[PDB]
Each structure stands twice: as C-alpha cells, then as structure tokens.
Amino acid sequence: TQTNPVPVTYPTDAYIPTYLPDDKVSNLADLKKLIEMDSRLDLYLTRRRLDTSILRCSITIQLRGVDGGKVQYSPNLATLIGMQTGSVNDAVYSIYKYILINNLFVTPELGEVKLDSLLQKVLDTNAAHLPLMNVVQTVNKLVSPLPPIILDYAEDTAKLREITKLALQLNSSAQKYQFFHELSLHPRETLTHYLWSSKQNELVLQGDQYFNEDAARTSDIYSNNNNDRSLMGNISLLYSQGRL
Amino acid sequence: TELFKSKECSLILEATLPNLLSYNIATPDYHLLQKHKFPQELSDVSKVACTFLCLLSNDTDDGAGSAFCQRIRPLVLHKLADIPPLTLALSEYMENT
C-alpha cells in the first residue's frame, strides 16, 4: 500500500440527518445501530486479517528439487547452532539469540559487540568491538547453496456505491423536507429571502453574456454602452500601469 | 490499568504494536530465497512506537503493563532478528525483559 490514502471521485459513506422527527420515523437510531454493528464486525474482521499472519568423466545432474528451503551451512556456523541444515532465517535468529544469551552488547554501546572465541572463529576476525551490521552481513556469505548429485569415476464497492447514492437521495429528501418545514414555521422572512437570493443568483448567472465569440468581434460593446459600467472605465488605470 | 481493561482494546496491541515497529522498512524477504529454483534505517512511526513501548515497559510490581509485555517479547524478538536498527532501539525493554 501507499503512505497517503487514494483520492477517488465517487462519494463514500455520506452523513445521516439527525434533525428528522423521530416520533414518525423511529428508524434513524436503528440505522445507527446497524452502522455501529457493521463497524464492530469490520473491526473484528480487520483484527483477524491482521492477526492471521502475525578418460574418466564425471557425472553431474542439475536436479529438479533444488529449492531454498534447506540451504547448506558452513561447518563453522553449523557447530555454533547445532542443526545441520534447518532454514535460512533460523540461523540468523539462533545467532542473535546466542549473542543475547551471552550478553555481549553492554553490562555505539549496542552496535559494537564483544567478540568471543566462537564469534572470532566463525568470522575470521581479530577485533574486539565490531558492529552487528557487519555481523549479520557476513551471514549471507557464510551460507552455501545445496550441491547437486556428483558421481566421479468486487461487488462490495458497487454495493457501497449504491448505499452512498441512496443516502444522498435521503439527504435530498431531508433537505427538501427541512425547507418546507421552515417555510411552515415562518412564512415571512423566507419568501423575502427567496426574492433576494434567487434575484442575486439570476444576476450571477446573467454576469457572463458579453464575452462570446460573435459578440466580442462586433462593436456593440464599446460603442454607446455607458450603461454597462463594467468595462470602458479602467482605460485610465491600465494605461498608467503599462498593461496596454 | 484503564488502557488494558476491556476485552477488545487490550488485544489490538497484541498484534498491531509489533506490526508498527517494522512498518515502511525494507525488511529482508525470504520468498526470493525460497524461489531460486538490509534497510539500515527506520521510519517515522517506528521511533514513536519504540518510545511508547519503552515507557510502557516501566510498569513495575507486575501490574497491567508487565503482564502485557511478557506475551509480546517472543514476537518482537522475531523482528529484532532482521532489523539491526531495532538492536540500537528498544534499549530499556530488553533490560526489563
């Protein structure tokens, strides 16, 4: 996965209105109970999906079962563990646990370790302090591969989309209910509000009409249109700034 | 004792708290080692999780913290075997087991 969530264009998990009268519906609290049911069940499923993993010629034949399940140890690294050929991760875990039992870190103070006799014999070194990075890096060198035989001589996204679309339809029905409910509560200051706001919206939608293709190429913008007042008044300002 | 109280809040950190340690860290994988046929760094959440776990390890007298930290160390030791910055990190939790 990524670090940031993926930006999508479709809505997801819209709100539920709480201003609806519960004396007639009596179902929004039950829908909230279903939402918290789904959240608890998805919480348990997410915790389970996270916890579910946490001349004499020689005969040589490249075998079919050459796998990385049993990879050969060096004889120096084998006597430090005890197993002959166990794994590739169990060797590193056993070396780290052996150092943790020997308490070689401290009695950097944790990077450099105290070299014991076996830790010098398996690494062919002679230093006293050596970092755990260079301890672990040589483990890939000390492990040899297995030699062959040598003989010598969905629907959930669309469902959530449908639920989100139906919740948006519910939000539309709730807002259209709330507008008529406020108009039933007060009839005076909402019709003057309509006559103001719809007039301002018509003035905004009628604010882009003198900038068309065949309207600007003609001369019925500049000539004799002193009633427009939008343009032909800033020619004394744009000339003083050099915009021309 | 308030945080490790209920049956669903004290079991998330049984698996997510080791999972946030080796987060956004290029751990050495083993599928390429099994299908033949090291990061040297940390992340932003890793130091915060290590500091939170080390301060959680200061629960003395075997209370609600020390009973929790004994079931997590065999799983955190599997992550310390692969990431050598996790040897320098988690200093106090290793001294307090």
């Binding site: 006597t79 430090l80 563990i81 005890g82 197993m83 056993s94 646990k97 052996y98 039992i101 076996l118 | 079931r71 065999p74």
Partner: peptide, 30 residues
C-alpha cells in the same frame, strides 16, 4: 496454546545451545 508452544520451543532451543556449548568441553580435551 500459542503461549504454551513458545515457552517450550524457547527452552528446547536453549537446551540445544547449551549442548552446543558442551560440545566444546569435549573438543578441548582432545
């Protein structure tokens, strides 16, 4: 069950490391 498996497997690996340390006591006498 996961606690009871790990608390025996760690003791088995400790016993294997102790036997691997005791092999040196037989190698130093030869």
């Amino acid at each position: 069950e996961k606690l009871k498996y790990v608390k025996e497997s760690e003791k088995m690996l400790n016993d294997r490391l102790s036997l691997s340390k005791q092999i040196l006591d037989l190698n130093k006498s030869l």
